[PDB]
């Protein structure tokens, strides 16, 4: 039913069009930390704890 047929005369028939799409993405931030003291290092029985 929807084939693009022509006739011998021609004319302004069978016009078409186009389209485009866009995509996106984003970034985020993370982090964490820890704490200690000097006596925790100096008096601990295991060196190389850090």
């Amino acid at each position: 039913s929807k084939l693009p047929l022509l006739t011998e005369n021609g004319g302004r028939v069978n016009r078409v069009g186009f389209t485009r799409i866009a995509r996106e993405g984003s970034i985020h931030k993370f982090g964490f930390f820890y704490e200690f003291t000097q006596e925790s290092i100096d008096f601990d029985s295991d060196d190389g704890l850090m």
């Binding site: 704490e35 200690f36 003291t37 008096f43 601990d44 029985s45 295991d46």
Partner: protein
């Protein structure tokens, strides 16, 4: 915070869990304290006779 606390007297360190504890808690000189002999006075007086 990670604290040493006092492993002796029953307050475990923060790093140690329920199963663990500190291994070294004191330092040992390894040089003992000794007492010398008592001096003798009557002994040098004597002379010896063989038998």
């Amino acid at each position: 915070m990670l604290n040493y606390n006092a492993p002796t007297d029953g307050q475990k360190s923060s790093i140690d869990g329920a199963n663990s504890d500190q291994m070294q808690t004191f330092f040992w000189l390894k040089k003992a304290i000794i007492t010398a002999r008592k001096e003798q006075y009557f002994m040098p007086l004597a002379s010896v006779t063989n038998m």
